[PDB]
Amino acid sequence: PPHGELQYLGQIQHILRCGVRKDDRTGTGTLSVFGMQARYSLRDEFPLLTTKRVFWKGVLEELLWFIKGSTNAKELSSKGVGDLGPVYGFQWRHFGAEYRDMESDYSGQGVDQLQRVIDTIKTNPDDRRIIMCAWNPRDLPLMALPPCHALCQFYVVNSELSCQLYQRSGDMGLGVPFNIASYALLTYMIAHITGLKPGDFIHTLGDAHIYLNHIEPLKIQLQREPRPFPKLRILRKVEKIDDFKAEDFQIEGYNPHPTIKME
Amino acid sequence: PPHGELQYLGQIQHILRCGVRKDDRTGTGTLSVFGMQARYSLRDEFPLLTTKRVFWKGVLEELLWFIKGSTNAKELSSKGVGDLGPVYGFQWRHFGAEYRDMESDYSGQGVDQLQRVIDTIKTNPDDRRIIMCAWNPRDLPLMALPPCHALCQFYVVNSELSCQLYQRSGDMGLGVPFNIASYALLTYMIAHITGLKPGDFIHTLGDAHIYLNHIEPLKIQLQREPRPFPKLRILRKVEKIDDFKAEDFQIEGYNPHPTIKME
């Protein structure tokens, strides 16, 4: 079967050829297509794109930072990759709780969406509601009951854990490759602690767009041939999602094309 | 280009051939595939499936019922197609409001997601947050901040309004054809009141499944060749979403194959 990365490259090509001009929130232009989806297998391989070197270090370190529930930018930068407000970390572990400061103790406050997902998987794997949501902090004060930016739906069958990420919008050049790796990793972690094997990672987008200044660099990435995806190994038996450490993970066989800078 | 309905038929075929056995909430079995998407054009045509006669009357009447905000089953059945609790209608127009009884006056109570969508479209068409959500009433008392069942994201570009429906799960045999028509109609209505032309309707699914007792009837539907989609006409200029009446709509050129009963 065809290499998974061909879906991404195909989507980039489609946007360049059929995308419509549309400005973002800051009046910056993009080429846009509404409604996209791709499926990346997680069975014996990890979807870390190869037509450009993906910043794996930033992916892994940022995810661990989210899982910590931290809202302190210093804790992330300290890792080489500062109150940020109610960001993903806080929303994932203390959903619904009122935000104070990055030092406040939110134990038992709000809903722990993440642990709930893990709890639901081990208490009722057939459940159709294993869903986790995240908002753009910016939208919270904007209106009553603002819509989420993204949602993760997990699915279990035949001892395999799959995940579908639906994002309101997707920055195809910069954000997508990074997020494919990010959520594929989250699925690997959750599958590990729940004794399941990773299945598929489905990435679905609303406004899939390419920023004008990324067009030239993307046209070049498209000339590159994907190399077999690497493998992600967890060289340690972990029991709680909170116990994972960067050292517990090891990417193997990652042979990417040169780094590509996107403005 | 290929008839749009071929996506649905193709998805049915894929589930029958690759779907995995999985039980629903009641222990009833299904053939399931996680992660699906299809795109139906709404430009000069309406996606009312033809490989089986779809219950258009029920679609149109149910949608008008939702838009009314009604929670009285009698109001719908009276149309030939009774407190139901906080169902879609109530959630769409009084989102967040505490439910009492189908007679209570909820004016100004809760968030009117529907009108907000319409308001956002006419005040900022580029917005990436034109989202509306709905929950299964059943999940509300179940836990704090339960996940939604479905969400509608609208998108505007070049004077065309598109909509993407993401559903936690999809009953491929019974619910999907009906819902494709339902949300395609909603997009037509919203586009009409906002002076935009209908663009695309994107249907995305989490657990896309076929109930065991529908397999045989679906295998037969698959032997049928789709006929050109009909057209939906709005023979009246309407200004508010609440003013639409069943008579305002007229399906033309609908030449479907015989009705197919699904248990």
Side-chain angles (χ1 to χ4, degrees), chain A residues 180-243:
Chain A
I180 289 174
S182 180
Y183 287 97
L185 170 54
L186 176 61
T187 303
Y188 256 80
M189 294 180 170
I190 294 174
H192 184 278
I193 67 174
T194 57
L196 308 177
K197 299 173 301 173
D200 286 317
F201 168 61
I202 301 87
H203 198 181
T204 293
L205 251 34
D207 184 340
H209 60 270
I210 290 178
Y211 278 95
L212 267 40
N213 49 294
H214 297 174
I215 296 178
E216 216 46 51
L218 287 170
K219 285 186 180 178
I220 292 177
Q221 193 179 339
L222 284 172
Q223 305 165 186
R224 307 178 177 186
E225 179 178 302
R227 285 88 94 86
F229 277 136
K231 286 179 179 183
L232 169 67
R233 276 189 167 56
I234 300 182
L235 27 67
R236 216 245 297 181
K237 199 292 170 296
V238 184
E239 291 189 357
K240 298 213 310 168
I241 186 72
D242 307 275
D243 298 349

Side-chain angles (χ1 to χ4, degrees), chain B residues 157-176:
Chain B
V157 84
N158 292 167
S159 297
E160 298 198 328
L161 176 64
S162 292
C163 168
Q164 170 164 21
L165 170 71
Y166 179 104
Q167 292 178 301
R168 183 161 83 194
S169 62
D171 176 345
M172 293 297 290
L174 273 175
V176 174

Side-chain angles (χ1 to χ4, degrees), chain A residues 35 39 128 153 166 168, chain B residues 35 39 128 153 155 166 168:
Chain A
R39 175 188 307 272
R128 295 173 174 178
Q153 176 180 1
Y166 179 104
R168 183 161 83 194
Chain B
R39 175 188 307 272
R128 295 173 174 178
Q153 176 180 1
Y155 169 103
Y166 179 104
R168 183 161 83 194

Side-chain angles (χ1 to χ4, degrees), chain A residues 76 104 231 256:
Chain A
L76 180 51
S104 307
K231 286 179 179 183

Side-chain angles (χ1 to χ4, degrees), chain A residues 9-196:
Chain A
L9 301 172
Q11 298 172 310
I12 290 300
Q13 177 163 47
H14 178 63
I15 297 172
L16 294 175
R17 296 160 59 173
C18 307
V20 177
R21 280 295 296 284
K22 187 179 183 186
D23 292 349
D24 69 8
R25 181 171 63 70
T26 66
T28 304
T30 68
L31 284 188
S32 170
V33 165
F34 185 60
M36 209 159 259
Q37 184 177 87
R39 175 188 307 272
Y40 295 92
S41 180
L42 308 178
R43 307 183 187 80
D44 298 290
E45 71 174 1
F46 187 87
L48 184 59
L49 304 200
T50 68
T51 56
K52 88 176 181 186
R53 166 179 266 80
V54 173
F55 190 30
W56 174 247
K57 212 86 294 176
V59 177
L60 170 55
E61 213 61 69
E62 179 196 50
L63 188 59
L64 289 169
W65 180 67
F66 284 146
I67 293 172
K68 284 184 180 179
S70 177
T71 53
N72 177 180
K74 295 193 174 185
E75 302 202 304
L76 180 51
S77 63
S78 62
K79 302 297 184 166
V81 305
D83 191 298
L84 300 175
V87 289
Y88 279 29
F90 180 88
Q91 294 175 50
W92 277 22
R93 332 301 269 75
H94 305 294
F95 178 46
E98 176 184 295
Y99 187 66
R100 288 172 287 179
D101 63 65
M102 48 174 256
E103 296 303 303
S104 307
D105 184 307
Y106 306 86
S107 298
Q109 299 182 65
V111 177
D112 190 332
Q113 306 191 66
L114 181 49
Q115 190 57 55
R116 185 160 78 181
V117 158
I118 296 163
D119 285 351
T120 304
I121 292 174
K122 50 218 308 174
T123 66
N124 188 197
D126 290 355
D127 206 324
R128 295 173 174 178
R129 309 161 299 190
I130 314 176
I131 300 171
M132 221 187 307
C133 302
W135 283 252
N136 185 318
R138 178 173 184 293
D139 299 320
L140 302 179
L142 275 171
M143 68 192 96
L145 307 177
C148 47
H149 165 74
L151 78 74
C152 297
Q153 176 180 1
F154 293 93
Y155 169 103
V156 179
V157 84
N158 292 167
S159 297
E160 298 198 328
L161 176 64
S162 292
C163 168
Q164 170 164 21
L165 170 71
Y166 179 104
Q167 292 178 301
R168 183 161 83 194
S169 62
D171 176 345
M172 293 297 290
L174 273 175
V176 174
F178 187 90
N179 282 155
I180 289 174
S182 180
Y183 287 97
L185 170 54
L186 176 61
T187 303
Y188 256 80
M189 294 180 170
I190 294 174
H192 184 278
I193 67 174
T194 57
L196 308 177

Side-chain angles (χ1 to χ4, degrees), chain B:
Chain B
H3 187 299
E5 188 163 359
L6 287 179
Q7 306 173 83
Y8 173 75
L9 301 172
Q11 298 172 310
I12 290 300
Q13 177 163 47
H14 178 63
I15 297 172
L16 294 175
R17 296 160 59 173
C18 307
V20 177
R21 280 295 296 284
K22 187 179 183 186
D23 292 349
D24 69 8
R25 181 171 63 70
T26 66
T28 304
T30 68
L31 284 188
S32 170
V33 165
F34 185 60
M36 209 159 259
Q37 184 177 87
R39 175 188 307 272
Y40 295 92
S41 180
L42 308 178
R43 307 183 187 80
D44 298 290
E45 71 174 1
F46 187 87
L48 184 59
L49 304 200
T50 68
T51 56
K52 88 176 181 186
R53 166 179 266 80
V54 173
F55 190 30
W56 174 247
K57 212 86 294 176
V59 177
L60 170 55
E61 213 61 69
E62 179 196 50
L63 188 59
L64 289 169
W65 180 67
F66 284 146
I67 293 172
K68 284 184 180 179
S70 177
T71 53
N72 177 180
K74 295 193 174 185
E75 302 202 304
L76 180 51
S77 63
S78 62
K79 302 297 184 166
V81 305
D83 191 298
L84 300 175
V87 289
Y88 279 29
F90 180 88
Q91 294 175 50
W92 277 22
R93 332 301 269 75
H94 305 294
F95 178 46
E98 176 184 295
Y99 187 66
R100 288 172 287 179
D101 63 65
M102 48 174 256
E103 296 303 303
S104 307
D105 184 307
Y106 306 86
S107 298
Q109 299 182 65
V111 177
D112 190 332
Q113 306 191 66
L114 181 49
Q115 190 57 55
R116 185 160 78 181
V117 158
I118 296 163
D119 285 351
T120 304
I121 292 174
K122 50 218 308 174
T123 66
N124 188 197
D126 290 355
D127 206 324
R128 295 173 174 178
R129 309 161 299 190
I130 314 176
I131 300 171
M132 221 187 307
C133 302
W135 283 252
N136 185 318
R138 178 173 184 293
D139 299 320
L140 302 179
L142 275 171
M143 68 192 96
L145 307 177
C148 47
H149 165 74
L151 78 74
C152 297
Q153 176 180 1
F154 293 93
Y155 169 103
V156 179
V157 84
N158 292 167
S159 297
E160 298 198 328
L161 176 64
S162 292
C163 168
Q164 170 164 21
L165 170 71
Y166 179 104
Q167 292 178 301
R168 183 161 83 194
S169 62
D171 176 345
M172 293 297 290
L174 273 175
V176 174
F178 187 90
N179 282 155
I180 289 174
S182 180
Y183 287 97
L185 170 54
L186 176 61
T187 303
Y188 256 80
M189 294 180 170
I190 294 174
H192 184 278
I193 67 174
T194 57
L196 308 177
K197 299 173 301 173
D200 286 317
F201 168 61
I202 301 87
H203 198 181
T204 293
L205 251 34
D207 184 340
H209 60 270
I210 290 178
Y211 278 95
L212 267 40
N213 49 294
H214 297 174
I215 296 178
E216 216 46 51
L218 287 170
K219 285 186 180 178
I220 292 177
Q221 193 179 339
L222 284 172
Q223 305 165 186
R224 307 178 177 186
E225 179 178 302
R227 285 88 94 86
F229 277 136
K231 286 179 179 183
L232 169 67
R233 276 189 167 56
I234 300 182
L235 27 67
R236 216 245 297 181
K237 199 292 170 296
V238 184
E239 291 189 357
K240 298 213 310 168
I241 186 72
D242 307 275
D243 298 349
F244 277 122
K245 294 178 66 182
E247 317 76 57
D248 297 341
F249 308 81
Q250 176 173 295
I251 287 294
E252 314 185 313
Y254 188 41
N255 185 190
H257 281 270
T259 293
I260 290 180
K261 291 302 174 184
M262 305 263 180
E263 301 178 303

